[PDB]
Design a protein around this ligand. Structure first.
Ligand SMILES: CCOC(=O)c1c(C)nn(-c2ccccc2Cl)c1C
Ligand SMILES: [Mg+2]
Ligand SMILES: [Zn+2]
Length: 323
């Protein structure tokens, strides 16, 4: 209904409530937001993407995100897609990226977890799943998400990049593959390290806008932008954050149950009989989220200062929730 329209006024804002748009769009947050983002950024016009075609692709793609998986469903793709769209508008990165690179980043966030089964890369590897076998144990899930996302474009009624040149399609394919592969947690510590080297030698301009040399520097900041967007839950308002926690602990605990049935060794954060939902977030923020966002904030200061404050407040609420 028109309640949806009210919520899409916050499209360019960090405050968007993606759960709300899910509720007013026949449970299709990803389609919705992607359409809203491409209209807002004039991407359909710039790349001559038929409107009809874009909807069908997005619906098909959203259909491959398993609705019966607690966290890694279409809601999350929509959320990362929207956050990426906001982080892309940050003052420090103004006019830094071409419209092909902007298209690549959002498109990447939208397919970045498509067909997620609800278990980790590690689980699939230790159970010899067809997927681990297929991908030789290296970034199993992410390689797959990319495989599905691009398999869906091998059709006339679904190929949105039909009016991109040979070079434009390849130049985007290359960037998208890189962004989604960077969302693999095992690559997190090395990613944060290369982001720290970027900040060390950061060169802005007179207007406080970063000067990026070539592809190597632009794709590096995009990889980290999508990665931050993936780890953005604890920077959102407390109401939205606690709900995400509930959803990721649901998915994790079901993987813990699945592991217990098969007789494997049950991980600590996946065990519903000893894990503290509250200590899980404190630690998640101290060693993973804050170090990353503290570095990103340094890269674009003071644009991400409001987020950094929200993250400490969110962290402290979770800390006081523990006795
Ligand atoms: C919303 C709170 O987030 C988490 O606790 C959390 C943890 C811990 N691991 N993950 C996670 C799960 C799958 C892929 C990437 C990440 Cl960061 C998430 C989302
Ligand atoms: Mg992922
Ligand atoms: Zn994700």
């Amino acid at each position: 209904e028109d309640h949806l329209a009210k919520e899409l006024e916050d499209l360019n804002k960090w405050g968007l409530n993606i759960f709300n748009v899910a509720g007013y769009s026949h449970n299709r947050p990803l389609t919705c937001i992607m359409y809203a983002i491409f209209q807002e950024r004039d991407l359909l016009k710039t790349f001559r993407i038929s409107s009809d075609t874009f909807i069908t692709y997005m619906m098909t793609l959203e259909d491959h995100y398993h609705s019966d998986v607690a966290y890694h469903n279409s809601l999350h793709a929509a959320d990362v897609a929207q956050s990426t769209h906001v982080l892309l508008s940050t003052p420090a990165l103004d006019a830094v990226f071409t419209d092909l690179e902007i298209l690549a980043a959002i498109f990447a966030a939208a397919i970045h977890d498509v067909d997620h089964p609800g278990v980790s890369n590690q689980f699939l590897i230790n159970t010899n799943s067809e997927l681990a076998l297929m991908y030789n144990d290296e970034s199993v899930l992410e390689n797959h998400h990319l495989a599905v996302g691009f398999k869906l474009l091998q059709e006339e009624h679904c190929d949105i990049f039909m009016n991109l040149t040979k070079k434009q399609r390849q130049t985007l394919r290359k960037m998208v593959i890189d962004m989604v592969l960077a969302t693999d947690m095992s690559k997190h510590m090395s990613l944060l390290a290369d982001l720290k080297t970027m900040v060390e030698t950061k060169k802005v301009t007179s207007s406080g806008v970063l000067l990026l040399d070539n592809y190597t520097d632009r794709i590096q900041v995009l990889r980290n932008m999508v990665h931050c967007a993936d780890l953005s839950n604890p920077t959102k308002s407390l109401e939205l954050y606690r709900q995400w926690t509930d959803r990721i602990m649901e998915e994790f605990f079901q993987q813990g149950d699945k592991e217990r049935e098969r007789g494997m060794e049950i991980s600590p954060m996946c065990d519903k009989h000893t894990a503290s939902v509250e200590k899980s977030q404190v630690g998640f923020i101290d060693y993973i989220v804050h170090p990353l966002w503290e570095t990103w904030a340094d890269l674009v200061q003071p644009d991400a200062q409001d987020i950094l404050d929200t993250l400490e407040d969110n962290r402290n609420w979770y800390q006081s929730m523990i006795p």
